[PDB]
Curated annotation (Swiss-Prot), chain C:
The keyword Heme does not apply. Keywords: Developmental protein, Differentiation, DNA damage, DNA repair, mRNA processing, mRNA splicing, Nucleus, Repeat, Spliceosome, Transferase, Ubl conjugation pathway, WD repeat. Homotetramer. Component of the NTC complex (or PRP19-associated complex) which is associated with the spliceosome. The keyword Oxidoreductase does not apply. Probable ubiquitin-protein ligase which is mainly involved pre-mRNA splicing and DNA repair. Core component of the NTC/Nineteen complex which is part of the spliceosome and participates in its assembly, its remodeling and is required for its activity. Together with emb-4, necessary for interaction of rnp-4, a probable exon junction complex component, with mRNAs and spliceosomal snRNAs. Plays a role in nuclear retention of unspliced mRNAs. GO terms for molecular function: ubiquitin protein ligase activity; ubiquitin-protein transferase activity. The lineage of its organism: Eukaryota, Metazoa, Ecdysozoa, Nematoda, Chromadorea. This is Pre-mRNA-processing factor 19. GO terms for biological process: cell differentiation; DNA repair; mRNA splicing, via spliceosome; nuclear mRNA surveillance; protein K63-linked ubiquitination. The chain holds residues 1 to 131 of 492 of the full protein. Belongs to the WD repeat PRP19 family. It comes from Caenorhabditis elegans. Residues 1-62 form the U-box domain. GO terms for cellular component: cytoplasm; nucleoplasm; nucleus; Prp19 complex; U2-type catalytic step 1 spliceosome.
Length: 60, 151, 121, 41, 131
């Protein structure tokens, strides 16, 4: 019962700090994650054309 | 007329207050009615009597019927510390015995007692209520945590 | 060898000593102490991260190690609670002692004034 | 031994603070703030 | 690419790191800087074209980037950051306790104050009761 009292205290301090900064850090996290998705879709599109170009050089 | 003339009075009267006020140390939220009971004959009894007035001054803001200068109290305090001797050093043995007291002392029958002197069934009731107090403190926190979490 | 950190009292994997006091620390705690408090933790003198001298230098089951963490974390938090509980008890003893002292000064003040009357009876 | 004086002193201190016993032990402001500052850093 | 150049500030497509800098540059930038100035823009150390290595990703065996946010390293990291906070918290509590516990031991005058009251009151009584 003493141990759980401190876990709950540290939980409160974490939650209160989380209330200050979670909304910003999650927004910042998404803004980084969005960049990876667009850059991955760039790589996906770039490699698709290269596969298609090989089909072209084969047919030609 | 409102700086130094009254700033002196602000600090002067603060030096008349008890050191518990001046240091902002903890002080009880209500003066225990048992803490003023005395045999009215020992030196300890009149010091306990005056201590009860100091507590009422600091807890209830009920000032004493007589007030003393810092000079009287410092002259009185000088008379103590010139008399007092053999003030014990802090050591590992002292740490051991104070820690033992914090486990040995529990309230029972609405009074603080040794744990080992109580009847066994009274020890069980005391430890039950001691545990139930901690479970109260947890639940008071957990509700606050869940409130913030839900948001 | 076994080295004990002055902050945590635990065996440390990275013992470091400060020139401002000569007490050994875990690097990570003392850097965080310096970064928060600036002083040496034991001598209270000014300290800085460049004044730190590095000292010279198995696994069993993941379900077991996770249970060793659980039990060890409960011990660390139990200690922290007992310190907060003991610290309030020390403050409660202290403030009581000052009240006894201040009440005794009022008694000694009261009696010493009354003792002047015996010279003019 | 000193334990007698320690016990009686502590007993009086508990008795003076009797009505506060139901309060949980506090967290000092310096310690709460130094937790938060480390977390923010 | 995800690499951002330290000097141009752009997300580069020609990532190169130099051994003296420990820092990331565009190839097209650093070669002319070496040509015109022979110097690391960051540390102001010397540079030469053999000190430069170009970054790559997505080779065979290259693990998929974890994006789930949770990870074993990051959980162990924040469990470590909890532990450091609790020990430095506990250390300052232990220091606070030592200060309070020290002075209340030095302040243990109260029995000697009581003897002074006994001595004063008994003198008072003999001085009050002589007429």
């Amino acid at each position: 019962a003493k141990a759980q009292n401190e876990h709950l205290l540290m939980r409160q301090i974490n939650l209160e700090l989380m209330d200050e900064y979670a909304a910003e850090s999650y927004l910042q996290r998404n803004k980084v994650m969005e960049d990876l998705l667009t850059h991955a879709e760039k790589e996906l599109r770039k490699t698709k054309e290269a596969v298609m170009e090989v089909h072209a050089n084969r047919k030609m | 007329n409102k700086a130094k003339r009254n700033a002196e009075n602000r600090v002067r009267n603060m030096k008349m207050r008890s050191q518990v006020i001046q240091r902002s140390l903890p002080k009880p939220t209500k003066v225990n009615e048992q803490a003023t009971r005395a045999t009215n004959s020992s030196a300890d009894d009149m010091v306990k009597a005056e201590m009860s007035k100091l507590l009422a001054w600091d807890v209830d803001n009920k000032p004493p019927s007589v007030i003393y200068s810092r000079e009287e109290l410092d002259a009185a305090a000088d008379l103590i510390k010139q008399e007092a001797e053999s003030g014990p050093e802090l050591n590992s043995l002292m740490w051991k015995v104070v820690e033992q007291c914090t486990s040995e002392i529990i309230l029972s029958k609405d009074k603080f007692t040794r744990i080992a002197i109580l009847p066994r069934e009274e020890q069980m009731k005391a430890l039950n209520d001691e545990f139930q107090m901690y479970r109260g403190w947890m639940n008071q926190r957990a509700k606050r945590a869940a409130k913030v979490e839900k948001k | 060898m076994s080295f004990v950190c002055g902050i945590s009292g635990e065996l440390t994997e990275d013992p470091v000593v400060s020139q401002v006091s000569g007490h050994i620390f875990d690097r990570r705690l003392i850097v965080k102490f310096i970064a928060e408090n600036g002083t040496d933790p034991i001598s209270h003198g000014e300290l800085s991260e460049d004044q730190l001298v590095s000292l010279k230098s198995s696994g069993t089951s993941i379900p077991s190690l996770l249970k060793m963490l659980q039990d060890e974390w409960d011990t660390v938090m139990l200690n922290s609670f007992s310190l907060r509980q003991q610290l309030q008890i020390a403050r409660q003893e202290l403030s009581h002692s000052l009240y006894q002292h201040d009440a005794a000064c009022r008694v000694i003040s009261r009696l010493s004034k009354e003792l002047t009357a015996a010279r003019e009876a | 031994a000193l334990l007698n004086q320690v016990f009686k002193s502590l007993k009086r201190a508990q008795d003076l603070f009797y009505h506060d016993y139901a309060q949980p032990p506090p967290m000092p402001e310096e310690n709460d703030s130094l937790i938060r500052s480390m977390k923010r850093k």
